[PDB]
Symmetry: D2
């Protein structure tokens, strides 16, 4: 059962620009307020040679405030749960694929995550670590072949002001039948609360609220 | 000077799938409430053989409610005014280019518009007229090389429920120096209020509100 | 009837970055050797403020050497003839749409052409005129919904060596039924033979040879 | 040293549509004739629930016939060797990322490969196994930030004739300084010679020839 306070555990294995890494995270959140925080620790591949920000949005749409009038694809899916797949296409040709298989055991969400990144330019903001944060965003959610897709126009703020664009397309797949939502939106804001020098340690917060637009 | 009630006049010349057309419109709006309505009349190329909806978002971001804390690129640009260029990339490979050069004379906005569409599949929703409306959207606005870009994940609702995606990228260019806004959003909803059988006559409404996200 | 020497006449009307222009061309070619040359003259909008090279590949696949074993979509279509539509998507977000409606009258191909370009960055190679030529290419031709598509990975050579990529997708539509070709290729090389300082006058050559690959 | 007959060993680990798998291959080739063959055996994740063809072009551009006038980026890189990264963007939104780190030991090329695929539609040709083969192709090779990129318009032939497009962008990175080639092409043909019912066993051939175009 999904309570008002829930715990998060995760392990991400991945490779960006040939660099292998493993990251583990523990935290907690409030599913009905659409908030969560976690602490993340690089287990292998430190120091990461790329912008930590490309990972952060991979680190669960259960953590979203859903109003009564929009069916909540994520909450309805448990105890069985759900998985997602995502591509991230950056404007200079960097591409990431990502996935998360989310299970519930007691009061804790377990997150098995793969992340893979290719074709980032050597002098781009990713490989030179010139990103500051992701701007807030609005994810456009709709049903396509019986599952939920979310598309997002994401943007990283860069050093010197200036933006670097990435398009997300995520497919969310419930492991049981649930009532499918009509087209709707989820506003997102995501923030690195703290970190140490090489991002070996990172405290990371998210707020998500689902809505119907104007 | 931009007053609380302003008038709209326009002429669009274009070609979609080889089909030439001319459309003229007259209407009015409230720039500070971010609302406008117009009546449109096909002058040449009737009956249009494609979904009228691909044109509608081409039929002025002056008509947007801007809160005090976000510089209003569009209003600041007058009396001199501004122009925009847009590409629309549809998910089945249909591409449109569009432009509007906007002038102010008295209480009336004049809009000189070109629209061009290519590579729509013969059995796609556009050429078969299977679109119902554009979902509301949120445009992500940011400065790039000293002018304003807006990117949007747009979606047409189709007959049978089901969606058809299009990505908009618009470059907005003021004809004088204005104070540039930080990254921000504009929510949009657009609606065909009425039309006759072949869309020779169309009454078209828009609401736009600029904001800073979560 | 399509003879071994044929003549070319054309008029292109278009707008790039807001700049309106008209170009007319006359030349000639050898349809069965897959060669053609033309002289082009800017009629309106001189001096063009963008790289002339973005137009050149818009200035007829009749001019292609087709071996016996691949049906020749272009030649088979006359006397009735054919039209095409093209999008050109550049790697920095510049997009062009283009079209040509091709008629035969006597020994002369008439070409009615529209060209429209948007969202070229102010300091990009297009607006700064930093292009040198298009590399040769290979167009991948295939049938899709009963008409012929060609896709191409095009690249402009830039000043300083260095390349600027553009993807072409063209839909070719015969005005009668013809025997449809299986997947095949057309190699292309295109060359500005001469021009005057502001490209008001341009001599332009093309060679095209269709083939079946390795 | 790269001799006229060379051996191939490889291991691919990957996940497509959530399905984990491991494949190992052994074979051999002629680097200067640009030919190679290998036998592949699914070690984990049998039976694969997706079209084996999406993997095949991931299963070394050392195996390419390079004429004297084009510097051979791949051969020049050994004994040190090289790695590549690739994205594959399919026309219905399926995306794969891939990589290969290639080492030389004695007469044998070792290939450490990761493959990851997301967002393939449930009724698309990939998940329904409706692919027949990759058409031959031509890869456009050019230098970008001091390393070699190859772009390709790939197409799978489908059951019922009909094609399914994928764009490849690969970054090839030599592990020492080599003489960089000018823009050039590599023609490719790739063929499943034999396989058993569930593609647990696959015999796979490639021919690659580098050239300068028309």
């Amino acid at each position: 059962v999904i309570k008002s306070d829930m715990k998060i555990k995760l392990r991400m294995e991945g490779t960006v620009n040939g660099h292998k890494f493993v990251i583990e995270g523990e935290g907690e959140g409030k599913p009905y307020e659409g908030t969560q925080t976690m602490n993340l620790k690089v287990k292998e591949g430190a120091p990461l040679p790329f912008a930590y920000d490309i990972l952060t949005t991979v680190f669960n749409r259960v953590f979203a405030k859903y109003p009564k009038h929009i069916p909540d694809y994520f909450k309805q899916s448990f105890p069985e749960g759900y998985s997602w797949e995502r591509s991230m296409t950056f404007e200079d040709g960097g591409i990431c694929t990502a996935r998360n298989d989310i299970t519930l055991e007691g009061d804790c969400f377990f997150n098995e995550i793969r992340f893979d990144g290719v074709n980032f330019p050597p002098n781009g903001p990713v490989m030179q670590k010139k990103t500051l944060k992701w701007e807030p965003s609005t994810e456009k959610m709709y049903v396509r072949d019986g599952v939920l897709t979310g598309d997002i126009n994401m943007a990283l703020l860069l050093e010197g002001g200036g933006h670097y664009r990435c398009d997300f397309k995520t497919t969310y797949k419930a492991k049981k039948g649930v009532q499918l939502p009509d087209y709707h939106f989820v506003d997102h804001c995501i923030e690195i609360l703290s970190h140490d020098k090489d991002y070996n340690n990172v405290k990371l917060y998210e707020h998500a609220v689902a809505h119907s637009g104007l």
